[PDB]
UniProtKB/Swiss-Prot annotation:
It catalyses: trans,octa-cis-decaprenylphospho-beta-D-ribofuranose + FAD + H(+) = trans,octa-cis-decaprenylphospho-beta-D-erythro-pentofuranosid-2-ulose + FADH2. InterPro entries: ALO_C, FAD-bd_PCMH, FAD-bd_PCMH-like_sf, FAD-bd_PCMH_sub2, FAD_lactone_oxidase-like, Oxid_FAD_bind_N. Is inhibited by 8-nitro-benzothiazinones (BTZs) such as BTZ043 and PBTZ169; BTZs are a new class of antimycobacterial agents that kill M.tuberculosis in vitro, ex vivo, and in mouse models of tuberculosis. Is also inhibited by dinitrobenzamide derivatives (DNBs), which thus block formation of both cell-wall lipoarabinomannan and arabinogalactan via inhibition of decaprenyl-phospho-arabinose (DPA) synthesis; DNBs show high activity against intracellular growth of M.tuberculosis inside macrophages, including extensively drug resistant (XDR) strains. Belongs to the DprE1 family. GO terms for molecular function: D-arabinono-1,4-lactone oxidase activity; FAD binding. One of its GO terms (cellular component) is periplasmic space. The gene is dprE1. Residues 13-188 form the FAD-binding PCMH-type domain. Component of the DprE1-DprE2 complex that catalyzes the 2-step epimerization of decaprenyl-phospho-ribose (DPR) to decaprenyl-phospho-arabinose (DPA), a key precursor that serves as the arabinose donor required for the synthesis of cell-wall arabinans. DprE1 catalyzes the first step of epimerization, namely FAD-dependent oxidation of the C2' hydroxyl of DPR to yield the keto intermediate decaprenyl-phospho-2'-keto-D-arabinose (DPX). DprE1 is a highly vulnerable and fully validated tuberculosis drug target. Keywords: Antibiotic resistance, Cell wall biogenesis/degradation, FAD, Flavoprotein, Oxidoreductase, Periplasm. Its EC number is 1.1.98.3. This is Decaprenylphosphoryl-beta-D-ribose oxidase. It comes from Mycobacterium tuberculosis (strain CDC 1551 / Oshkosh).
Length: 426
């Protein structure tokens, strides 16, 4: 039934060995969880999707890992209610292709479509449209959670099980196995964006452009950010913003199949782009850490609360002065947060950087951790396998609430991961 397998996060770091169950048979999955429960816990079980998380949340050294990628059936698509009912193992690429002809758009899209719905919910992922759409959890209408008791629990965001539902969103698999979910899609009439580009010359300008009220004009916005240049060029950005195009906005040639699947003159208006172009160059650089890992690069993502913009500038300054130089930097202003205790996004200044691994780096990122922490920010479990339980708990003031919910639902700790042990969420 199971295969012992060396697992790592996306960037190939922090390996551990788990027994991997890989079956399309939901009943075998139910049986396996039950068997772990009847052994009284042991080293537990965790779900795994496509392994795009950079962290150690989708592995469980010495225990069970359940590869959910074979549960990939799309059960129903409904264009009136905009609801799709899909297995947790279906990936966003797969769903995007299946839903487009219905005029439905995946409501939150990360930098790669090679993630499962289960992984999307478990890490409450965010996209270029976060300030307008919230995160992936905001669009979950129901989900079926296989819990430690071996029961499949139907959860809703306002029902009697709302508490468990919202601990599952962003819960990193630690409430049980998401089997299946119903997602509310976004109506669209085309598969293209109409984009506006702007290039800033400085950090202050980047921040000004994000605080001048223009963000409200775009459903989607992100920026490519300079973290190496000496000030005042430090913080300058290439900002890509836009919204889904209506068919009248499409160039003549493309109006045929509008829902088709798949230095400083970087300034433009009303350019029409498909998903790949609009998100460029995220797709071509996505394999980077995996291609040169585990020894090449350390990704590092954090968000600082909106009101702490000065503290945010200081961290950027510290990064530039450090000697650790990152070219791949993505920046965004997050919008309002949701109600999941462990959700990563909060409104504020979000950036992912990617350091070359060098002498002094580990010590340096521990320094960043402290600053992010004190300034009221957080790290993201999808991007971390290095921080401490103390640091993480301090970054998530709702962690004890979350742990309490996890205790109600998994008293024997049937669910466990390397991450849960490292960060003391277990
Ligand atoms: C190139 C690249 C770009 C990215 N861009 C973004 C981005 O723009 N925004 C963003 O928020 N993230 C981004 N990520 C991170 C990624 O979206 C998340 O880590 C996501 O959870 C990965 O999904 P997965 O199916 O691969 O999950 P895995 O990596 O396999 O697992 C991640 C977590 O989900 C849990 N899980 C998976 N399936 C289930 C299930 N069926 N039931 C219960 N729990 C489950 C696992 O236990 C684990 O805790 C990116 C990653 C890469 C490699
Ligand atoms: C790891 C991966 N991240 C992203 O694509 C990404 C990160 C972020 N982020 O939160 O830093 C946001 C986005 C967004 F919002 F635009 F969808 C995408 C990546 C890929 C290629 C270059 C740099 C980062």
């Amino acid at each position: 039934t199971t295969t012992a397998t060396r697992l790592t996060g996306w960037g190939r770091t922090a390996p551990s060995v788990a027994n991997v169950l890989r079956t399309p048979d939901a009943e075998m999955i139910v049986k396996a969880v039950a068997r772990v429960a009847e052994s009284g816990g042991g080293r537990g079980a965790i779900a795994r999707g496509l392994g795009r998380s950079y962290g150690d949340n989708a592995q469980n050294g010495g225990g069970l890992v359940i590869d959910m990628t074979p549960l990939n059936t799309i059960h129903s698509i409904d264009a009136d209610t905009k609801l799709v009912d899909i297995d947790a193992g279906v990936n966003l690429d797969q769903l995007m292709k299946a839903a487009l002809p219905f005029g439905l758009w995946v409501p939150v899209l990360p930098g790669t479509r090679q993630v499962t719905v289960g992984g999307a919910i478990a890490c409450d992922i965010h996209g270029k449209n976060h300030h307008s759409a919230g995160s992936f959890g905001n669009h979950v209408r129901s989900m079926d959670l296989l819990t430690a008791d071996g029961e499949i629990r139907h959860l809703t965001p306002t029902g009697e099980d709302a508490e468990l539902f919202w601990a599952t969103v962003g819960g990193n698999g630690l409430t049980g196995i998401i089997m299946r979910a119903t997602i509310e899609m976004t109506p669209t009439s085309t598969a293209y964006f109409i984009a506006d580009g702007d290039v800033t010359a400085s950090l202050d300008e980047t921040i000004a452009l994000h605080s001048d009220g223009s963000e409200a004009r775009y459903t989607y916005s992100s920026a490519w950010f300079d973290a190496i240049s000496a000030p005042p060029k430090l913080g300058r950005a290439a900002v890509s913003r836009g919204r889904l195009a209506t068919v009248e906005q499409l160039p003549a040639k493309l109006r045929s199949e509008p829902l088709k699947f798949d230095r400083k003159s970087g300034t433009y208006r009303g350019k029409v782009q498909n998903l790949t172009q609009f998100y460029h160059p995220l797709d071509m650089f996505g394999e980077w850490n995996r291609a040169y890992g585990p020894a090449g690069f350390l990704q590092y993502q954090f968000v600082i609360p909106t009101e702490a913009v000065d503290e945010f500038k200081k961290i950027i300054g510290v990064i530039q002065a450090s000697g650790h130089y990152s070219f791949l930097n993505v920046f965004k202003l997050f919008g309002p947060r949701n109600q999941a205790p462990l959700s990563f996004p909060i409104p504020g200044w979000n950036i992912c950087v990617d350091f070359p691994i060098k002498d002094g780096l580990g010590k340096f990122v521990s320094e960043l951790d402290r600053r992010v922490l004190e300034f009221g920010g957080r790290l993201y479990t999808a991007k971390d396998s290095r921080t401490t339980a103390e640091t993480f708990h301090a970054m998530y003031p709702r962690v004890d609430e979350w742990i309490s919910v996890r205790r109600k639902v998994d008293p024997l700790r049937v669910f466990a991961s390397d991450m849960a042990r490292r960060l003391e969420l277990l």
